[PDB]
Design a protein around this ligand. Sequence first.
Ligand SMILES: [Mg+2]
Ligand SMILES: [Mg+2]
Ligand SMILES: [Mg+2]
Ligand SMILES: [Mg+2]
Ligand SMILES: [Mg+2]
Ligand SMILES: [Mg+2]
Ligand SMILES: [Mg+2]
Ligand SMILES: [Mg+2]
Ligand SMILES: [Mg+2]
Ligand SMILES: [Mg+2]
Ligand SMILES: [Mg+2]
Ligand SMILES: [Mg+2]
Ligand SMILES: [Mg+2]
Ligand SMILES: [Mg+2]
Ligand SMILES: [Mg+2]
Ligand SMILES: [Mg+2]
Ligand SMILES: [Mg+2]
Ligand SMILES: [Mg+2]
Ligand SMILES: [Mg+2]
Ligand SMILES: [Zn+2]
Lengths: 307, 59, 110, 115, 153
Amino acid sequence: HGKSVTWWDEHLSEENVPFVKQLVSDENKAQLASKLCPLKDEPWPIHPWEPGSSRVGLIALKLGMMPLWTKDGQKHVVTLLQVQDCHVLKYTPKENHNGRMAALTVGGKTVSHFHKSASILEFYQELGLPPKQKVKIFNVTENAVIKPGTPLYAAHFRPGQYVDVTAKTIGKGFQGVMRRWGFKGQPATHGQTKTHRRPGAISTGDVARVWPGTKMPGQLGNIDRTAFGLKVWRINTKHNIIYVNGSVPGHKNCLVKIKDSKLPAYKDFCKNLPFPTYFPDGDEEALPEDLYDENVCQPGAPSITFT
Amino acid sequence: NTRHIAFSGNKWEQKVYSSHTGYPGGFRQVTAAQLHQKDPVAIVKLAIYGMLPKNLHRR
Amino acid sequence: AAPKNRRSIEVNRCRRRNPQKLIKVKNNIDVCPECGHLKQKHILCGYCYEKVRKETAEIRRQMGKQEGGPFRAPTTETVVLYSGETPSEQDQGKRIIERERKRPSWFTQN
Amino acid sequence: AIQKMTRVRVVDNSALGTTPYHRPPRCIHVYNKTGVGKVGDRILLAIRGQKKKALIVGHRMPGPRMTPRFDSNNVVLLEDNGNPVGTRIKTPIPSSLRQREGEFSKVLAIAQNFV
Amino acid sequence: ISHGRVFRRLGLGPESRIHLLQNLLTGLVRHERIEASWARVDELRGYAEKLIDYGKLGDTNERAMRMADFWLTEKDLIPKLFQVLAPRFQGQNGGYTRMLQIPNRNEQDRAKMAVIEYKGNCLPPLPLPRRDSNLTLLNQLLQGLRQDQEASS
RNA sequence: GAUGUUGGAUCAGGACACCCAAAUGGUGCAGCCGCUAUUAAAGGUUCGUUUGUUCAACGAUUAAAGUCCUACGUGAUCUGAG
RNA sequence: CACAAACGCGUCUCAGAGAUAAUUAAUGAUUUAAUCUUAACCUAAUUAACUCAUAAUAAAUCCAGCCCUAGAACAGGGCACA
Ligand SMILES: [Mg+2]
Ligand SMILES: [Mg+2]
Ligand SMILES: [Mg+2]
Ligand SMILES: [Mg+2]
Ligand SMILES: [Mg+2]
Ligand SMILES: [Mg+2]
Ligand SMILES: [Mg+2]
Ligand SMILES: [Mg+2]
Ligand SMILES: [Mg+2]
Ligand SMILES: [Mg+2]
Ligand SMILES: [Mg+2]
Ligand SMILES: [Mg+2]
Ligand SMILES: [Mg+2]
Ligand SMILES: [Mg+2]
Ligand SMILES: [Mg+2]
Ligand SMILES: [Mg+2]
Ligand SMILES: [Mg+2]
Ligand SMILES: [Mg+2]
Ligand SMILES: [Mg+2]
Ligand SMILES: [Zn+2]
């Protein structure tokens, strides 16, 4: 038995190719809109807010960057993060993860069934969601737990707050020493021969080995990084778009991990936020289409006059 | 009951366990008191580990 | 830098018999429904493309004869004919290439 | 960005500014820890074989949007007291300079046109 | 680094690249199908597409005419571009070129080759990949599902 | 039957007999500077004119512009003014 | 900046707790006063390191092709809409 390679679309005919697609997308919209109502389904017990609590996070899409002006006249540049499809996936009890905090696994953007693994499609069939592209694990306290297969919207971070972002930084491949590290070069013109880039002496004569940490040319930039202490300026409710401050590591259009700030200055800031998470059903109110921080100049306004 | 080890004399204070990570400036020295504070198993484990013959069967 | 020691045949067997330097077994090979020769799944059949190619070459020769010189090329659409065929009205007003071989089964009339 | 060895042009009306010399006045030292000076930074000028202190007024390097960018690098002659050794400054000065009153007070007081 | 770049570097430089494409495009507009290196066929694809989009702009447009001058070397071909090759594409927006991969060349070089062709040329039909027919056990098995989705609606 | 030798360039590993930053004792310490001594090596320790020059002088500054070792570190990485 | 990108001269973001060194003090014996003690018991005050809270990563196996902000090769992410 020499078994052949098979992809999903190999044996389908002209007739059946669109049918399969229409069918899969149909079942997808159905399964999505079905999970659209968490609170009336089989909601888990909601717990009050204690001071040592830690919230759930979000998975976003980096759109691009845009300028934004404060009422004070200063100009900030901000990054638009969008929440496309966000659902909590599985749940790990306290003892079963860190011995300390409970793991909540969150899914990202929707992909096609046809290219994933058997095991994974099994995992989503026992859930009822479409497969998510990027899946990250958040650490969370017992009072912040949610129920697996629950939707997470972008109103989750109320405007003004500090968040943290983790993502894979822009990959630059195999880079020389002057990029990767930032060693000065050798001078260009004075009779230097074939040296204008190279690291130069890499060690000491006695040691006769080169040390286990030594900086050398190599892989640069595809790695995880985290930006701390970013302020959130404004929120869009309809398109689910956060405007965070400064820059977020990754290429634009990349998938990005958002949490509340773990920085020591902000420790208790989570007392004012909708805590298990935000629930559009529960409040039964329409949030204004944009939530602005008190500082921001709104896209329409008096056109500032100092005095 | 490893955590309840006794050390004769003043050894708790003056016996040092040294370790090196290999990176320049990766040289650590810990007092027996501190090492016993961090890892309750560590002291008896390093005691025993140094008393077996040095061949592979030690591992 | 000059190698400090001859390497043993042991070390060489290790290096150049590595699973990476071995030729991988291609699993995408199939047979072509017409001539039953072998072809890779994503590539055209070699043997089929051959008879197609030969016929294209010959029809290009005869249409090279229907043209007088290097720079002179037809403004009409062309339609190629085979023994026993007469032009349809859809195809008339066009340049016609006449050929001896009766129209090959794989080339349709349309 | 005005740095060591930049030729600067002295805008205020002073003895040392207008009188000719075989050397164009050169900047020796900038007092920022960065070797680069900006508008409202402080320089040590070599003029006519002696050292005077100066205040950078405008420069040819671009700066944050809505800052005026000038055709030439312009300095005002200044002593240690922070007193401008000049009477007045004709060519226009960045309005941003009014931010710091403390150090530049007198310099601002003798300034004619702002932009 | 290479990030976000839509052009290969082929031949002795940028100019050499344009002239390589020139030759290929002349060949393609003349013979209506050519077999060339896969990198270069795939490169030619875009230009072969948009050259037909100038043909549609009309014979009278000047910007199209000086364009046809640069890109079609053999001068006879230019009336072929406007009067022949442009008019037979009308309804079809982007559907001009078929590009398919041939077995690798038989010479010691062993490159990776492709044939590129205009739709509707009069040449023997290329032995295109066939789709599995509908009587196939699996496709026949899907028909049931379709008819049941029709029966439920 | 060769361990290629000064000074720079690049990249620095280490000591502490601390030049800065950090806690302190004593003063012929009122405070401001200081002058001495103890404990502390994670991090720093500038740019120029003249000399091949390390050293040194001199201009301008800095919180400081340490003393050393590593084949007077480092030429199968570079430079040869000497 | 003649590429859709790269890039600086441009923009953003930067941390809790625990320990101790030298030295200051409280109760207090040998020696019933005294006495910080190489005497107990609790102690207190105070650098740097150095630990660690916290953060990253963390779904075993379809992978022919073809795209890519992922790449030297192999790896990695896409290919249902639309
Ligand atoms: Mg890359
Ligand atoms: Mg350089
Ligand atoms: Mg050179
Ligand atoms: Mg040479
Ligand atoms: Mg003089
Ligand atoms: Mg590319
Ligand atoms: Mg080439
Ligand atoms: Mg392509
Ligand atoms: Mg020898
Ligand atoms: Mg060093
Ligand atoms: Mg000391
Ligand atoms: Mg040091
Ligand atoms: Mg030496
Ligand atoms: Mg030397
Ligand atoms: Mg050497
Ligand atoms: Mg007593
Ligand atoms: Mg007492
Ligand atoms: Mg840790
Ligand atoms: Mg994949
Ligand atoms: Zn065939």
